[PDB]
Write a protein that binds this ligand. Structure first.
Ligand code: HEM
Ligand SMILES: CC1(C)[C@@H]2CC[C@@]1(C)C(=O)C2
Ligand SMILES: [K+]
Length: 405
């Protein structure tokens, strides 16, 4: 259903793309979004779906807008509008200058030095999951690896019990791919209800877990408030539970369908980090945006104060003006251009954790289960939203072709 076109939006710029249910979804979600880059589609279009909003369709505009926080504010960064208005996670809902003191604190719980200290446990968990799967000759990848591997690591980092995963995962998914049972505001209220007593507990009796570190932290040398600590911890949980989880499934679906790409990584393992970057480009998965702070003419188009603009991080790397033959996965691609982890002052703080999780997965899986395929018959379905994903990924292999390490 289509919101009436506002007076200021030109009719020739209308392209009614629905970011939560794109027309071409059955072709694969990145393909469905890539319809925005077909030959006669402008660089900046308006969709009347999901309340009405702009979409930048090309890397050049996506990058420019993410650099210009004075015109394109993160105070309302999600479509639809009621989700963006309710969204108050820190640091994402803040612009410079005030955003930066909170980044610095977040970076202390998810930054490179923390990832270094988690390295052994990440390795161990990946190995244990894959060894337990190996003799079985099949798995449901999304439930059996893509979910438990990154999520258990996050719950370890945060000092949260694993049995809380089903509830937290349900709430996080309502924020990014809602099934309709909860609004964003209701899912956020429920995440905060979970965190409130845990934050108070850990301010009274600090531990060394991520929640204690945020809740007792300072920002530019003054103490964080309880409310700030909640709004930061909520975001960290969303990052831990609904990013890498989805990305792994796109990457493994691809590797299951492409024996020659797996053979490349089996024959030349040194290539894994490069392969991780090219998969992060091809199977990019996030699309959020910004709100106009004022009336502003951008690339010949009159934007009005309060308009929302979706700036899909997914699209920059898929743009043939950034990467030739963008739908082709080439592990030797010379200049891998992408904004998969975002761009500008909100560049992902979890990207070092994400890459370590991805590269360990590829190394440890291909080492033990070098040969596998999609279960015969399976019609793999994607789902689209703020973070896109894979509904189910049934894999099979012959245990005789596997290796214990
Ligand atoms: C493949 C995995 C990941 C992708 C593709 C991803 C992508 C993104 C993108 C696109 C943004 C910027 C959003 C904006 O500008 O509005 C971002 C921000 C952030 N992400 Fe990641 N993310 C991933 C993994 C993680 C993980 C594992 C964590 C935490 C455990 C995390 C924590 C953060 C935080 C805290 C921010 C906010 C930074 C700020 O606003 O200054 N992300 N992520
Ligand atoms: C868009 C994101 C991937 C980024 C980290 C989690 C997420 C859903 C946000 O709310 C900011
Ligand atoms: K808001």
């Amino acid at each position: 259903n289509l919101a009436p076109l506002p007076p200021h939006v030109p009719e020739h710029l209308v392209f009614d793309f629905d970011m939560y249910n794109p027309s071409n979804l059955s072709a694969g979600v990145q393909e469905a979004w890539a319809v925005l880059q077909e030959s006669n589609v402008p660089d900046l279009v308006w969709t009347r779906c999901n309340g009405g909003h702009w979409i930048a369709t090309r890397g050049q505009l996506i990058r420019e807008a993410y650099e210009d926080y004075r015109h394109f504010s993160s105070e309302c960064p999600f479509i639809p509008r009621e989700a963006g208005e309710a969204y108050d996670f820190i640091p994402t809902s803040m612009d410079p200058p005030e955003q930066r003191q909170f980044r610095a604190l977040a970076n202390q719980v998810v930054g490179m030095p923390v990832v270094d200290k988690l390295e052994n446990r990440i390795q161990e968990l990946a190995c244990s999951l894959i060894e337990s799967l190996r003799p079985q000759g099949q798995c449901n990848f999304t439930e059996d690896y893509a979910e438990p591997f990154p999520i258990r690591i996050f719950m370890l980092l945060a000092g949260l019990p694993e049995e809380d995963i089903p509830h937290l995962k349900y709430l996080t998914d309502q924020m990014t791919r809602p099934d309709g049972s909860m609004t964003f505001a209701e899912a956020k209220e429920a995440l905060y209800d979970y965190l409130i007593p845990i934050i108070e507990q850990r301010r009274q009796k600090p531990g060394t877990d991520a929640i204690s570190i945020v809740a007792n932290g300072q920002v530019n040398g003054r103490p964080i408030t309880s409310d700030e600590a909640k709004r930061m911890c909520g975001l960290l949980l969303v990052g831990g539970l609904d990013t890498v989880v989805n990305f792994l499934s796109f990457s493994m679906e691809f590797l299951a369908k492409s024996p020659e790409h797996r053979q490349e990584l089996i024959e030349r393992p040194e290539r894994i980090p490069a392969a991780c970057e090219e998969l992060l480009r091809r199977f990019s998965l996030v699309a959020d945006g910004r709100i106009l702070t004022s009336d502003y003419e951008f690339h010949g188009v009159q934007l009005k104060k309060g308009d929302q603009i979706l700036l899909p991080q997914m699209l920059s790397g898929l743009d043939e003006r950034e990467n030739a033959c963008p739908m082709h996965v080439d592990f030797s691609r010379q200049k891998v251009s992408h904004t998969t982890f975002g761009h500008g002052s909100h560049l992902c703080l979890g990207q070092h954790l994400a890459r370590r999780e991805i590269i360990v997965t590829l190394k440890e899986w291909l080492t033990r289960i070098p040969d596998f395929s999609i279960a015969p018959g399976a019609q793999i379905q994607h789902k689209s939203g703020i973070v896109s994903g894979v509904q189910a990924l049934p894999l099979v292999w012959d245990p005789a072709t596997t290796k214990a390490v």
